[PDB]
Structures are given as C-alpha cells and as structure tokens.
Design a protein around this nucleic acid. Structure first.
Ligand SMILES: [Mn+2]
Length: 276
DNA sequence: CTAC
DNA sequence: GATC
DNA sequence: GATCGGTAG
C-alpha cells in the first residue's frame, strides 16, 4: 500500500468549481517524450495550461505534432544560449497571456533556459527547472547562488500580483518527500543547504506547497524515479515537482495532483486545480 | 563522453 | 542514486 | 561508502 493518488477534488474550500487547470511536467527530452506518446496523455488530461521542463530542443526545430494542439495554441519556449540538447523549458496556454517574459532578470542565471514567467489577469504563473547540484555536489555552491537570487526575484513578482510557481524545483523539502531520507543527506537534491533554501523561498515570498498543504501527513508520494535499478517499480522516488502558491490563492485551491501512472519520463506530471 |  |  | 549503473541530445 505505497501510493495511489486520490480522486480529483474539483472544488475550492468555499464550494466553487475549479475554473483553471495547470499541468507541469519534466519530460527528460521533449522529442523522446512525444515518441513515447506523451501528447496522447496531455490531450487527454486537457489542461488549460501546460508547463514542461527539460525540453532539450535547442535545434530551433520543435516537433510538428505541437502545432496540432488547439487547446494550447499560444506556446512559449526558453532554451539555453549555448548548450545543445540540454535543459530547456516551455509553457503552452489555452487563452492568451497578458505578457510573457523569460529568465529571472539576473544575467548569470538566465543563460540556461530554465524560467518562463506568464502574467495573467488574476495571477502570474512561473514555471521552472532548478539547476541541479550534480554528482559529488560539484555545483552545490552555485545552486546556493541560484536559490537566493531566485526567491528574491519571485518575491518582487508576488509583491504586485498573486504567484503560482510550478515545476521541477529539484529538491525533496522535508524527509517525507523521498524514499531514503537518511541515505541521501549528502546526495544532490536533498542537501541541508538545498532543503534550507526551499524553506527560505516558502517563508520569504511567501509561498505554500499546494500538495503538502492539502495532504499534510501523506507519505510515499513522489514525482521522480531514477530509471536505474528499476526504481519506479519499487516506488523508490523523490518529490521534486511542486505547485507553490501565494497564501491568497489558498481559498482558490481546489486540488493538487500527482499523475503517478502517467508515463513518458523519469518524472511524472503534476496537475493543479484553481477556482479563479 | 557528459549532465542528469 | 539505489544497494549491500 | 565502494560499486554498479539508465539517459536524451
Ligand atoms: Mn531529468
């Protein structure tokens, strides 16, 4: 009895039906993901907005099937300035966004196509793919420089309008957010410095982890599973994909979902419901 | 190979 | 990174 | 931890 995602709750705390649906998903290779029929699932889940991480489509050529999407006509991308088939994000929307900007306004963090900010009417949606510290924590010191700058950026956005941050935030916040908590203290993605940075972002903006708010004690819930050692089969995974919301968006919160059965990548999709 |  |  | 160990560009 490890983990099975509860039925979608399509109503806010006050009783109103969810008016918006945002789906985020790290695909570990866009093309490879489509080949694995990743669209068939998205077209099925038919989100109002689609956010993707690790697109790795730095050939200026995005798949054809993408233009064969009526519900996500308005599409925005952001790839690295100098790195082939690496990182890369994307944001597809049903309705048209008031304004869409890239990066975090910091020249040393805007070089790897990791951030896409989409400003709407009632809020601002930021999808992101956080810089991984790597093996042997080679880039740990840099990640720390990223985190601060990042939360500082978002704090200035929320100050003006409600924020919804979705995406691979690359970090299991508290122990309940991964299988082996004790066996990874020193592994990339669960360092004290990273964990602390996540707590920072949350209390500074401020923001609220959607799922960990609705499901306070639910364990064994994850969004990542290494392809090695058949990890997904044993549910030996991490929860690195979040939907952080401004506090004022909490009464608008209908449900935060984990699409565990959905295939096509080492990560699974997460979906949010908002009654706006 | 490399970063994941 | 999960294992032993 | 010493080892063994999946990946899309
Ligand atoms: Mn990945």
């Amino acid at each position: 009895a490890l983990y099975e995602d509860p039925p979608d709750h399509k109503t806010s705390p006050s009783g109103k039906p969810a008016t918006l649906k945002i789906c985020s998903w790290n695909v570990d290779g866009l093309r490879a993901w489509i080949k694995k029929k990743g669209l068939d699932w998205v077209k099925e889940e038919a989100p109002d907005i689609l956010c993707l991480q690790e697109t790795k489509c730095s050939e200026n050529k995005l798949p054809a099937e993408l233009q064969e999407l009526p519900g996500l006509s308005h599409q925005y991308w952001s790839a690295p300035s100098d790195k082939e088939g690496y990182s890369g994000v994307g944001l597809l929307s049903r309705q048209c966004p008031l304004k869409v900007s890239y990066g975090i306004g910091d020249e040393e963090h805007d070089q790897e196509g990791r951030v896409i900010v989409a400003e709407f009417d009632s809020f601002v949606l930021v999808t992101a793919y956080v810089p991984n510290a790597g093996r042997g924590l080679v880039r740990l010191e840099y990640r720390q420089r990223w985190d601060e700058a990042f939360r500082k950026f978002l704090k200035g956005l929320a100050s003006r309008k409600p924020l919804v941050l979705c995406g691979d935030l690359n970090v299991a916040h508290e122990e309940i957010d991964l299988r082996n908590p004790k066996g990874n203290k020193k592994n990339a993605g669960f360092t004290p410095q990273e964990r602390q940075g996540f707590g920072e972002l949350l209390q500074a903006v401020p923001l609220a982890d959607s799922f960990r708010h609705l499901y306070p004690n639910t364990p064994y819930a994850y969004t990542f599973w290494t392809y090695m050692m058949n990890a997904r089969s044993k549910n030996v995974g991490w929860r690195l994909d979040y939907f952080l919301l401004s506090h004022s968006l909490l009464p608008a919160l209908c449900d935060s979902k984990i699409r565990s059965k959905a295939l096509g990548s080492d990560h699974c999709p997460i979906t949010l419901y908002l009654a706006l």
